[model samples]
Target chain A: IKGLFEVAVKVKNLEKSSQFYTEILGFEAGLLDSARRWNFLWVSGRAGMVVLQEEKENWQQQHFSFRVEKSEIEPLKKALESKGVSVHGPVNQEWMQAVSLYFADPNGHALEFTAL
Target chain B: IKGLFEVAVKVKNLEKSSQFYTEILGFEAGLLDSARRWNFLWVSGRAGMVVLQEEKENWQQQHFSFRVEKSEIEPLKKALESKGVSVHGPVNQEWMQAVSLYFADPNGHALEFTAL
Candidate 1:
């Protein structure tokens, strides 16, 4: 295994999910893997990024998470709240040695951000 | 926006999926997020890893990819095939400037391994 590359998800509306990741979460759009069908987001560092594919089909049980700065947790929570997105805990998990915040995208996919 | 951390998927059989990732894909088993519900796997390097959650419900349209060593591509394909897993391709894409192989886990999540 080399490294974690990309986490791809099928979203109901590409534009909405794309905006949430970019405008709200601050990810920069990188390459369009396939024009409007798939889009890649550039996350900071060499840790790889995310890819979104426009799809009408529904999927349950998929979650893509990011490791964020500890300081950004509060601001991220605020950002999500400001955007009228329902946000869950910046909860602490002692075993994992991280704090995590959870939310759902427009397509109802569970997402989380973890900070150590 | 810190970095890509993890790509979590809900699997039908925790035992099978866990073994496929660890025994076949060479991922190291990490802490169990929840005793029987979820398990984490450590991918090589600083590039985070993956989390597997046992779920009975069906889902569609999710894929997780890994960036692997170029030379290891062939060996990886053979390993997958030897285990009776249907292998798709070690296909080259000029656009991405990389080679990729696609496969599925026991839960039917599309998985890819790419090398630049």
Candidate 2:
């Protein structure tokens, strides 16, 4: 296999998830063929982008973490909080510098914007 | 701050997780200083490796899925099952071509090896 790498996001509603990525996060939605049961998206902010999947019962819950930088950490946190998002501390982790702020789209998928 | 990408694995035991990654999964362990609350790993299987996080309670549950070729799906499934890894169906989704199987490391973090 050439290897296709992607994070599987378990969302309750595809339409709601699609809106959050486009409106709140400003991500461009890729072609979604519901007949094929796939909803793809290309987030402009991230490097590889994200593909949102709506399948499987809410058995396995997961969240994604994005790495920005040490510089933009505070400003983005502040901006997200202003938008009613919850902000967490910039915990000094050993591997790299990181601060994470967690939020959820309408589909109940946990999305995190972190800077490293 | 060029931008670093990583997936966080919530594990119950760091040492057990380390052993599975290094021994069975054939991953090279990156430096981990628990005092700093971070554990880094370079997984040989995927493009980007995984970071094992030992902190935070078992509230957030997540799993990963990997893409292989359709033809190789069965053989890989057999191999994984032979190694006592759990195997599941090749569900045809409405979006992309995919078949998924689930497994867990020593830390009880869900891991999936799939083909798309």
Candidate 3:
């Protein structure tokens, strides 16, 4: 396998999660497969993809991180805050030399933007 | 954000999950943070990473997909089956124009090795 092909996450509300990821975090909206009750979003390019599936069952908190340019960390945090999202950390993980901010979506899934 | 940075998965047993990912899937072994009770594994080089965290609570199924070469899908299925993993589909998702195989990890998480 190459790298991450995609991450599929369960969300409480598809529209709400879609709005959060797209408007707040700048994820490019790809497709809303309403028939499947899932929304697909392109991540910053063809670099990766995210699929937001409406919670059917077995819903629990999950975690995924987005790769951010080191320079974009501060600005991304600011942009997220302006959209009323509570973000924590820009703290350095010295071991990984990665700085990350943690937050949640409309659903409970933990989201991060990390610079390595 | 450029793309997916990493994925963190909850496993029932750290050592078991670590071995499953590294040995069965060929994910390069990374740090095993005993203090944090998480085993980090690099996904096919620096393309991405997976963190095998011991389940503390709120454990439930999560899903992630790995990018595989189109030609590798059949071989990958055979390899996984040889390791006693029950392989599922290489079914074409006409909508995404991708071929994906479905299976579970040692944890309940759904995993896909997909080719686009």
Candidate 4:
């Protein structure tokens, strides 16, 4: 609700996308987070960022993940269920110290709520 | 570095996100700009749009746009190059009635000042 934060696009090759964003687009490469197979690109020093997520799933299903305050996800999930939405995942994305709930918005776009 | 009017993500299976936003998230489907292959899902009725630009070119490189008034693009290009940043594309995305000037930030993120 605040505004758009991060948009992740799955890339074929991390090495190639990483270079493309940095060399061509002027993105400053942040942590590789290679343990999780994605590289972070800082857009204007956190004015925004494009997360270059590696897709070995033949990936690139685009969606927006809204960041929630850590303690709020529980009630958020409760609130979502109150709406008759099947909120999935609350999964622990351990490396990032985040919990994410996966669901679809009413318009058919997949939605994610990440609490870090 | 300025205001972000929209963030477009190249999506796989337009039909997928197209469904969630309306049915589950419960937002109205605005237009399917099928010619350009994007689904415009309005956020609170054009307060913003998270555009689902189709990914056919192995696409979905995420970037943000700074909104500009129509008259300013010419001088904007001049302003851009003044900083030693190469400017690209005032390309006619006539479908959207938009003229966009593409450039990169010194901080390393691709940016556009799009005038519609």
Indicate the residue-level lDDT of B20 in model 1: 87
DockQ of structure 4: 0.03
Clashing pairs in 3: none
Runs in model 3 deviating more than 4 A are: A56-59, B56-59
Clash count list over all predictions: 0, 6, 0, 22
Query: What digit string (tens of lDDT, one per residue) describes model 3 on residues A1-116?
Result: 78876898888888888988888877887889999899998887666789999985677778888888889888888888888888898889887777889998888788988787
Deviation in angstroms for B74 in model 3? 2.1
Candidate 2 structure, TM-score to reference: 0.56
Per-candidate DockQ vs. reference:
0.61, 0.23, 0.72, 0.03
The 10 consecutive residues of candidate 4 chain A with the worst lDDT sum are A1-10
lDDT of 4 by residue, A1-116 (tens): 22343455567678876775566445677667788788866655544456676766644344565546668778878877775668897799664456778775433345566664
Fill in the DockQ of model 2. Answer: 0.23
- Provide TM-scores for the models: 0.82, 0.56, 0.89, 0.37
Q: Candidate 2: misplaced stretches above 4 Å?
A: A1-4, A8-17, A23-116, B1-5, B44-46, B107-109
- Candidate 3 residues B55-113, lDDT tens each? 85777777888888889999999999999999898889776678899988988689998
Best by DockQ: 3
Model 1 TM-score on chain A: 0.84
lDDT of 1 at B54: 82
**Which DockQ-derived CAPRI band holds candidate 2?**
incorrect
TM-score: which candidate is best?
3
Candidate 1: tens digits of C-alpha lDDT, residues A23-106: 877777777755668888767644566788887755554678887888899998998999888889989978667788999888
- Evaluated with lDDT, which candidate comes out highest? 3
Rank by lDDT (best first) = 3, 1, 4, 2
